[PDB]
Design a protein around this ligand. Sequence first.
Ligand SMILES: CCCCCCCCCCCC(=O)O[C@H](CCCCCCCCCCC)CC(=O)N[C@H]1[C@H](OC[C@H]2O[C@H](OP(=O)([O-])[O-])[C@H](NC(=O)C[C@H](O)CCCCCCCCCC)[C@@H](OC(=O)C[C@@H](O)CCCCCCCCCCC)[C@@H]2O)O[C@H](CO[C@]2(C(=O)O)C[C@@H](O[C@]3(C(=O)O)C[C@@H](O)[C@@H](O)[C@@H]([C@H](O)CO)O3)[C@@H](O)[C@@H]([C@H](O)CO)O2)[C@@H](OP(=O)([O-])[O-])[C@@H]1OC(=O)CCOC(=O)CCCCCCCC
Ligand SMILES: CCCCCCCCCC[N+](C)(C)[O-]
Lengths: 547, 696
Amino acid sequence: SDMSHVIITETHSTGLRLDQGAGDYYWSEMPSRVTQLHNNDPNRVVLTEIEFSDGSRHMLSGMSMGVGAKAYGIINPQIMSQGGLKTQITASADLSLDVGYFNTGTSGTIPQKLRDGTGCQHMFGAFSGRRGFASSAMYLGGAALYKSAWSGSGYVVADAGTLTIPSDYVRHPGARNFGFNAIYVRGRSCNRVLYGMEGPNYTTGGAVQGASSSGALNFTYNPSNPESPKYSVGFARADPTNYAYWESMGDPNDSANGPIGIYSEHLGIYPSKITWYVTNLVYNGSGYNIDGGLFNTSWKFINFIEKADFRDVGCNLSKDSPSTGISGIATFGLPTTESNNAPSIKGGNVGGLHANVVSIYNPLRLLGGSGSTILSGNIVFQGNGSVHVGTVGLDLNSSRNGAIVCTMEFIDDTWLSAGGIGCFNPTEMLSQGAEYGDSRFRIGGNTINKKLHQILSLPAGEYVPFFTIKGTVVNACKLQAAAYNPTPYWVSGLPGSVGQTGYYTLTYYMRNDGNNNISIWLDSSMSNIIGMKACLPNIKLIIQRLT
Amino acid sequence: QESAWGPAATIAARQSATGTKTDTPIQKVPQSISVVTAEEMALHQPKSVKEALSYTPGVSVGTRGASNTYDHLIIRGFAAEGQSQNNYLNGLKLQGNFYNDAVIDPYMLERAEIMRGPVSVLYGKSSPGGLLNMVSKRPTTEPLKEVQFKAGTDSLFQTGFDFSDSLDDDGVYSYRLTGLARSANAQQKGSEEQRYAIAPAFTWRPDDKTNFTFLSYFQNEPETGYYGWLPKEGTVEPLPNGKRLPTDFNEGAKNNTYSRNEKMVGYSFDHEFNDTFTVRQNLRFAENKTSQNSVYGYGVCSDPANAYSKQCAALAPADKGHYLARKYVVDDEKLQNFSVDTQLQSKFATGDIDHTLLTGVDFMRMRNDINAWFGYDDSVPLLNLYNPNTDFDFNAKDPANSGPYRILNKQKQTGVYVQDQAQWDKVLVTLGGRYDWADQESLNRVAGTTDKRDDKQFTWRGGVNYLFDNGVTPYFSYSESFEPSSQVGKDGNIFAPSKGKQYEVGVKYVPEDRPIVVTGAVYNLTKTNNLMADPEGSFFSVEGGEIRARGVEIEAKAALSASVNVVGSYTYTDAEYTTDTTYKGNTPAQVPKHMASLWADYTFFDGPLSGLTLGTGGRYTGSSYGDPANSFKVGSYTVVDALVRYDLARVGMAGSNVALHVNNLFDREYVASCFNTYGCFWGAERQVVATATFRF
Ligand SMILES: CCCCCCCCCCCC(=O)O[C@H](CCCCCCCCCCC)CC(=O)N[C@H]1[C@H](OC[C@H]2O[C@H](OP(=O)([O-])[O-])[C@H](NC(=O)C[C@H](O)CCCCCCCCCC)[C@@H](OC(=O)C[C@@H](O)CCCCCCCCCCC)[C@@H]2O)O[C@H](CO[C@]2(C(=O)O)C[C@@H](O[C@]3(C(=O)O)C[C@@H](O)[C@@H](O)[C@@H]([C@H](O)CO)O3)[C@@H](O)[C@@H]([C@H](O)CO)O2)[C@@H](OP(=O)([O-])[O-])[C@@H]1OC(=O)CCOC(=O)CCCCCCCC
Ligand SMILES: CCCCCCCCCC[N+](C)(C)[O-]
């Protein structure tokens, strides 16, 4: 009774529905207790299990991101300079599935309701230029959109001279302060919305057209002096299912600017039920406290059986090598468990994966200790490569298998820059080299509590993914003309003023070294991208053993 | 007795091939035209063709100030497209692209005629403002053996020669060899100028009807001098401490270089079959190369153009006013130009009307391969203007703040024109037209992208002259022009050509018994389809702009006595952006409202001072706006030039003379012009030149 047993105190379930115009967003209103726990008691570890129509069940784990970005840098030395950036970022509360939370009170359909939920697309845009000789004002928009301390291209913009986004204007999947009361889940990945290459037009109202928008902010510097450079920076949350763009700044679906689309890798599985396993684990800033379930009816236990009455649930993935063997979009299959407790991987294109499963039956007590680290910094990748990035100081030999409770506490909104291309100033790449700039989106001080709790096993020596970022980017050219020379940001060149499409996948792995340490590994896989700057998402990882 | 430049200015300067492509007296030309002869240029000794036109109306010859790199002219408030030079040599365009513009030394020239207003009816695509036509020195009937020496201020040294003779004894074969080697220090410290030019010419004249002259001109300029920009803070207006930059300020790097090489060969052939049919053909092939490593200023750090530059940002807000932001350009160009112009002149009578029908075919082709690298913002370290220059690494081409410009420009123009000068008693109507097929092709070698546009344009000119027996010749003409655009819009297509139309009413006083040439003209010249800024939040250009220029030009040449010759001119210019997204209603930069110039020289023909010529002159430039926004204004100035010339004929050397030229006699420190707040040019300092010409 005193040994800090981890027990599931209460269980709640809901049936998903494709109602209210939700085409592929299987949604449901959360049970009142689940909503109260998710919002007003975020320290309590609640496990979320998705059950699919084929009978496979998966326990939500990790985080994932979806980036769609475009940028161009045309210039003519005698006439003008003009540049633009546009990035759409989606996030999910799962590594492979598209999971998020929203309010049923918001107007519109479910996709339009997502404009105020965690499933929205965070749209950032900058447009700049200057009419004059030898102008470099193509990069002024990038200098305004991103906060960078790096000494490079001439333009630097002060905080008062650009737009800063308050922390409450963005929607993290684990945000607990917005009072979400509904959940959605898809058997797909986050939408990588690839549309548009420019921010708001400074001669217009800056309105957002297309998708239902909310939280729209924009800054405009439009002096009456014709010699001054002009730039505009905009932000808006939009419905993830539609193309969102600023007024008079739409995307031409032409060769110079690359393709358009909404990209999401399907998994071949369709959700049908969601279960919440409320446990007695209470996160306390540094570790976890066993509170409740003291030694009853409907009191499930959790265990990691090392291979009938047990309900096995696939929790996390394990691979022997951090490299995915892919160059471009690397999709991890979903670790599920069939109706007969048989682990399997559903979908994806990464090989060598193993499905780790949990056992829920009606032990695995807390083991004293725990440890934490903050994944902070910038990693520069010049191709496909895996880099050791972190370490959490705890010994996993005492734990039953590698069972742990993991909490990713996001201190600030650096997660919005956790991606590569599109999450930093593309002018960082122009000064070729291993320069480690800190270019990031100008988000304000933190006021939103962002936590994700998961339980997962770390096999000895194997790599466990817990944070993926998928990005579809286009190094665009505004137009195809000899008069204006486009800037190659992350490609060798634009061989015909044709937009060069690129793909990448950043994955963070948690490896049980066995030398009383947990190492953190960041892996990158690129296609048609010469270099990238990954920003560590400032994630505080809290890990506690389970035995 | 009278001097050589006397009759030259008032008699020899009355014939004009330019403006009609036929040898027509100026009073019979329906358009304003000014002629400067070799004798006038011998007297004044202009440093370039620009200074030769210092006493003609409607042209702004010194907007660039002390710089001598190009012979750029602003005629009637207008310049060529791309701020190029609309200069013609021997009736064929000296076509240039980008920085590859050719200049002809005035010592190699026999005449310089400037046509004012549209002349596209004869010369194809051209600026609305006008045209400068230079005539190369031709072999002389009589022998010529002239050597010239110059020793001026700023370490100026020029040695030149001009030899002409007849190979045979009758005169069918004759040649001419004109050369000069010029070395000087530029006004701006650390800049020098070197020029070597030679002009071999050869005339084959089997008889009086036929004439074939081979014209060549080879020029080498290891250093062309200063071509930089200076801020208006420090030149027009005081620096924050209350001082001004010295007139010899050089904002460039120590290793700033600027080279030019010119090689042109051609011929001028005319032949008269009979009194009815005459044929003329002008041909020239030119190969010009330009190289350059230039660091140039781009206004102070407090200029709006440098609003967010990192280097200016790190300065204290007080210090931002006296730090000069700078950029650089590294350029290497190779231009190939070929032009041939064939004319058939027909003379016939239709009853009581005398017809001079000119039918011509003109072909031009240009190619320019540019290999440039441009420094953008923060590509050059800031320069402190309070300091009492070092090297620059032109090869460290950082892609963060610089970029390539590798362009192959191709141009082609074919034109067929018909002109009719029908004369009835005293009325002479001039009706002409021309059809052009200008094609342009531009290839971006960095991205392998091509821009191409073919233009079909028709321009016509119509003028009437009434020839009073008093010499008074009232006239009026309407002239059209076109100039194909080089920019592209949002869709990547080259714009339609801009067009210039002009109504001009004038009076010419060219008496037949007196040495006086007085001409006046009032004009209304409009350039429609001008390119302007996008009003819809884009930085591309759009069509639809319009600039209108009205004004009055008065020019007077007279020989009041056999000893006194007076050349004067006055100009009133009203240039205004009639339609434009910005600058609407503004006056274009570097265009003064009033310009005046007066010259007078006195020659002693008797007494102890016999053979001495005293010359003096003064050019006034009114205030002009320093930028298209008309934010600030460049003040007026008056520059006085003196001249002392002594004919060495009495001392024993006939034809020889020694002269002493002082330009800017009162050493006025003035800003010549500014095209924007960051590009300003100092006027030339006082220059004293002693020159000796010996005729053997
Ligand atoms: C008897 C009475 C007079 C009778 C007078 C009659 C003359 C009439 C001539 C009209 C035609 C014309 O205009 O003739 C010009 C000028 C020639 C001089 C003329 C006489 C002057 C003076 C006249 C005489 C005065 C008295 C030729 C020219 O300009 N050529 C330059 C050339 O560029 C133009 C080319 O394209 C054009 O068309 P485009 O494709 O662009 O659309 C042309 N077509 C036209 O015009 C058609 C036109 O519209 C039709 C209408 C005609 C109207 C006629 C009516 C009127 C008739 C009047 C009656 C085409 O001409 C021709 O096709 C031939 C023919 O037309 C000329 C033959 C007759 C004239 C000569 C005898 C001379 C006559 C006899 C005189 C003795 C030409 O080839 O580039 C070369 C360099 O190439 C590279 C290099 O590798 O670097 C590679 C290249 O790449 C490429 C590549 O792109 O090529 C691609 C790659 O994939 C790869 O394949 C790579 C390959 O590896 C490479 O093989 O080539 C590229 O990258 C470039 C890069 O752009 C760098 O800029 O660089 C230059 O070499 P450089 O610079 O390195 O040395 C070269 O300059 C040099 O030759 C010029 C040398 O001067 C001297 O000799 C002058 C000496 C004079 C005598 C001295 C005084 C005597 C006392
Ligand atoms: C003549 C075309 C020039 C295009 C670029 C203009 C800016 C650079 C000018 C440099 N400089 C002042 C030396 O001419």
